[PDB]
DNA sequence: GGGCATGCCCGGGCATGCCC
DNA sequence: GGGCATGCCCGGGCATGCCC
């Protein structure tokens, strides 16, 4: 059995999709999302709100899981972990991705694949709104030595029922950096000029 | 009975064929496939994704075997092994080909032919995709002294049922090297100018 | 009592001084010493030869101690350590400075000051030469996150008798980096243009 | 105590010096010596005759020892060994340097420094000649992967009495290669043009 | 002996954490 | 927000085992 989780978008029978909030591109804005690149640019240990959108309401007991994988083919089979520095200085210190502001968060270390994930219960949007927001946190920069070490990652968000069935899957690239607005504008300019 | 395994393409009743991802020809790209040559150019100990495509779904318990053989007639009967340097510094150290990212990988040392092979279970593409990707690893350069020693090899991929029936066979040439982009462009140029 | 060791040059009654071998300024030469800056530029985990010169021969049992301290006033009281990444992947893993090629090397963790040092016996130059060379090793880049973190250090070399009397002291600045030739030429140019 | 043996020439009270025979510079001559570079160019596993010259006859029981060390500073503390390939395919297989045609040859693995050496008894030149020749053999190319790996070496010849006293020391650089005449002419031309 | 292929050295230059 | 320093990617090119 493969230890590499799928990243292919699966909107599923519930119409599962992600949403992200517009940001305003200061050089060091705390987070900013590029629709053209399907890529979040954000700062380490700071809030990265992700919206959950569904056409049909999931069944009770549905869970929302987040997992990071390296985007490039030569690194895909390597588990994404926190670097030794940020690990040394609740959430186990080896986990890259945290969820803030949720009382039912669980951190999994898969017994077979060794991959990390963080799971919270799915809550339908309150009577009166269109989506559900999760406050994620990335605890390393993409550049961290001994961790992501300048390798781009994807975050895989899966909607799963209590029985474990995959109900939906979406993914976005993440670049954790000191200056999200600068790096977003640079990669988007490179895309237009040399893409 | 012959100890030289067949390399002849046998697409079989299941329409078995291999696929490879386009790469972009940097001089030292980690892997790049040449369709004109049916030849993978890749770097040692780095991921080499190979796609499995089928027209019909194989029965349960189907396995996928990979095995290296020397391409040239005068070397065909010699077992392809890891060189002593890379052998010394679950995969046995003598095996050239490894599979990354699979929990059910098996390494075989044939009791009679002494040939090495690595086997994983066949998994059908997930509901929502067209092929299955295996992450292969070549643990020597083609040039390694005491190993391949600058001799070209073929990788033979066989689809086999649990009973051992050959369901399909495909093969591609491999050149493991420091600069796959350079060597691919050089051989393709030699093919055009002097082939 | 102060836990900050002295860096002031004390050539002493034995005429103790340090020497360094000229290098040739390739961009990524493994080590190169700048006399104008009294500064070694070297690569991590690679040999950095340091010459011991004396006018008078030290008594038997003399020892040679090396110790790193931060050069800048605001960091001087912080112990120089290996960063967590290089620590994790006879020399204790927390020590920045190692000595290669000596059978009588000792690594000290000071019980009171917590500072690290590495000591070898002093050997007089062999009948027929002018100095004694010690092969030092710096196990982090100056830029290492969670370690030196881009802060310049000094290496303090003390000649001590077996009783612990300070016989001599010398020091040089160290910049461990990927391209010692580039960084040396850049700092020397900044010194000339704006020093 | 240092584990790096001295390479400094010590002609000593017996006037100890090496001699080498003129060769004639075919591209692949089996061995050829460059006086300008004090450097032997030779082929692997082939005879490399070295002459021993003395002004005064050594005492009975004098021994002749040969030992290889890396010439460059960043490799000097590493023991010079045979590569895994030539080790796998009398003299222990890990030893680079052998002596041919001598019935009293000894191979030492130093218990403390781990360095290899090969020793034969010193014989004075027969009544009627000026020097004594030893037939050395280098069992790897300088290029061998996992061995010298393209790093230049020195051979240190020491004349020692039976008690262990150093009587004399000389050294020459060695380049073991397929084409000694080509590589000698190339390095000598580079010396004139860019030295 | 002439010349090719290939592992790796080499300097130019990019990206990114952080000083200013 | 502008700009510097630095680890490392990148293509040019050298050296060397071996084919011819
Ligand atoms: Zn980190
Ligand atoms: Zn190998
Ligand atoms: Zn470090
Ligand atoms: Zn060898």
Author numbering:
A (entry chain A), B (entry chain B), C (entry chain B), D (entry chain A): 94 to 182, 188 to 293
Can you provide the manuscript's text about this entry?
The human p53 tumor suppressor is a 393-residue protein that in response to cellular stress, acts as a transcription factor by binding as a tetramer to a wide range of DNA response elements, activating various events including DNA repair, cell-cycle arrest, senescence or apoptosis. Mutations in the p53 gene were observed in more than half of human cancers. To uncover the structural basis of rescuing p53 mutants by MQ we investigated by X-ray crystallography high-resolution structures of the core domains of mutant and wild-type p53 bound to MQ in the absence and/or the presence of their DNA response elements. These studies reveal diverse binding modes of MQ to specific cysteine residues that stabilize the proteins and their interaction with DNA.
Also analyzed here, are the crystal structures of the corresponding MQ-free complexes referred as R273H-DNA and R282W-DNA (I, II). Crystals of R273H-DNA were obtained in the presence of DNA and MQ in the crystallization solution, but without traces of bound MQ. The role of MQ in this process is not clear. A role of MQ transiently increasing the affinity to DNA in the co-crystallization of R273H-DNA cannot be excluded, although crystals of low-affinity complexes can be obtained due to the close proximity of the two components during crystallization. The replacement of Arg273 by His or by Cys residues eliminates key stabilizing interactions between p53 and DNA, causing a large decrease in binding affinity, whereas the replacement of Arg282 by a Trp residue results in a significant conformational change leading to protein destabilization. Structural data on p53-DNA complexes incorporating His273 and Cys273 mutations demonstrated that the unusual HG geometry is dependent on Arg273 interactions with the DNA backbone between the A/T base pairs of continuous half-sites and thus, p53-DNA structures incorporating DNA-contact mutations or non-contiguous DNA half-sites, are likely to adopt the regular WC geometry. This pattern is observed also in the current structures.
